[PDB]
Amino acid sequence: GSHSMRYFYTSVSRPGRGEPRFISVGYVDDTQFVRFDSDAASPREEPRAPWIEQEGPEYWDRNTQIYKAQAQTDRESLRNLRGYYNQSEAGSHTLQSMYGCDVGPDGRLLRGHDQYAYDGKDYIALNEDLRSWTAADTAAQITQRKWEAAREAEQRRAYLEGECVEWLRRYLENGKDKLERADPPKTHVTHHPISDHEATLRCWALGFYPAEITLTWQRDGEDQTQDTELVETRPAGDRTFQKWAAVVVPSGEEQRYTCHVQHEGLPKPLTLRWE
Amino acid sequence: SPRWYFYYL
Amino acid sequence: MIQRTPKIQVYSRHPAENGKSNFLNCYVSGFHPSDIEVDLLKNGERIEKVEHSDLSFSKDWSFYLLYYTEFTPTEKDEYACRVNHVTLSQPKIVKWDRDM
């Protein structure tokens, strides 16, 4: 029912303090299920969701060996990037990598991702067509030419279309309800007097999963986009998310204001008024 | 599981 | 490199009621580079035994962490998040407000 699997890699060079740190987190949808850290006392892939702990030592050992080879690859990537940007040996640099696959309810590949950022800027990304690259700058074009020449896109596309989707398939089988269940938001409106003439209506969504949500204020059916304060969606700490939207309303116009909550946990959106 | 193909930038 | 200053939200896992057990959250995001220091404060003092998420980032490359501890709010008690980062000349403190 529209699921995705993503790996987020961070490699950080530290020229004084030894070799580079490699960390990985793996996600099914908005659920973190594995982690790896090269700075762990005995670096091993570790479960971060209950439904993955059923996998045996072979799972953890195999993945650990892969992260080790990935860390090494990233070390070489960081070295090349230093040269592309004529950077000094003294500076610490960051390579962030993200790859994964989005599948429809048919469980076949809807969208594939494979993208990199160097020192927190876009570097290179595989296009939706999984057949071409977007380079952010002239350095990233050096990488583009290499990968174009060596036809590594075809390889990537085949991984994304095949293996990625089969691992996702397996994880959904193991997850069952933990991953297929959309938890609708718990909603309420609070009233915050500003002066005797004005109050802030704050519309709340809590305990929702997944993270994707739309919160909007309407005045007599018309959208108040430019006059609505909206916090970034935030983790609650229990694998649920929170968000709120706030609008400043004149005294005695409260009932003109409707808060609208869209979430896949809701068959149809909720309309809330201050009560 | 993480992919076991590796590509140098 | 372009350095990015952390965004910070401080909030409870559940709607706050005086004398009822809860979790105090500080969510830091959009910072670069990834090295960051987050403390939770009770009345200006650092709370010991604070946990945090694994370093992750969203699709827009923005790094994020949740720092969190058990806590039982009251009328009197002031809770805060204190964040240190290369972008910050002084520690950034954001007070917890149950209405936000």
What ranges do the domains of chain A cover? Answer: 1-181, 182-272
Question: Between vectors from CA A83 to CA A81 and to CA A86, what angle results, nearest 5°?
Answer: 110
Dihedrals phi, psi of A88, to nearest 5 degrees: -75, 165
What per-residue string of b and e applies to A136-158 under the rule 16 or more CB within 10 Å gives b?
eeebbebbeeebeeeebbeebbe
Among A155, A46, A27, A41, smallest CA distance to A101 is for A27
Tell me the two tokens of residue C71.
């806590």
Alpha carbon distance C75, A114 (integer Å) = 49
Contact list in A for residue C65 (CB cut-off 8 A) is none
Give the 3-state secondary structure of A137-195.
CHHHHHHHHHHHHCCHHHHHHHHHHCHHHHHHHHHHHHHCHHHHCCECCEEEEEEEECC
Q: Do chains A and B touch (3 or more CB pairs under 8 A)?
A: yes
Query: DSSP assignment, residue A209?
Result: B
Alpha carbon distance A150, A146 (integer Å) = 6
**Sign of dihedral through CA atoms A233, A234, A236, A240?**
positive
Nearest CA-CA distance, residue C90 and chain A, Å: 22
Query: DSSP assignment, residue C6?
Result: P
Nearest CA-CA distance, residue A221 and chain C, Å: 26
Question: Between vectors from CA A245 to CA A241 and to CA A248, what angle results, nearest 5°?
Answer: 160
Strand partners, A66: none
Q: Please answer yes or no on whether C61 and A231 come within 8 Å at the CB atom.
A: no
Dihedrals phi, psi of C77, to nearest 5 degrees: -70, 130
Nearest CA-CA distance, residue A201 and chain B, Å: 45
Alpha carbon distance A71, C97 (integer Å) = 42
Question: Between vectors from CA A234 to CA C58 and to CA A13, what angle results, nearest 5°?
Answer: 35
Q: Please answer yes or no on whether A66 and B3 come within 8 Å at the CB atom.
A: yes
What ranges do the domains of chain C cover? Answer: 1-100
Tell me the two tokens of residue C75.
């009328």
Among C88, C83, C79, C76, smallest CA distance to C27 is for C83
Contact list in B for residue A80 (CB cut-off 8 A) is 8-9
Q: Residues 6 or more apart from A221 whose CB is under 8 A from it?
A: A258
Q: Please answer yes or no on whether B7 and A62 come within 8 Å at the CB atom.
A: no
> In this structure, are residues A260 and A247 in contact, taking their beta carbons and an 8 Å threshold?
no
Does a cis peptide bond (omega within 30 degrees of 0) precede residue A57?
no
Alpha carbon distance A35, C7 (integer Å) = 24
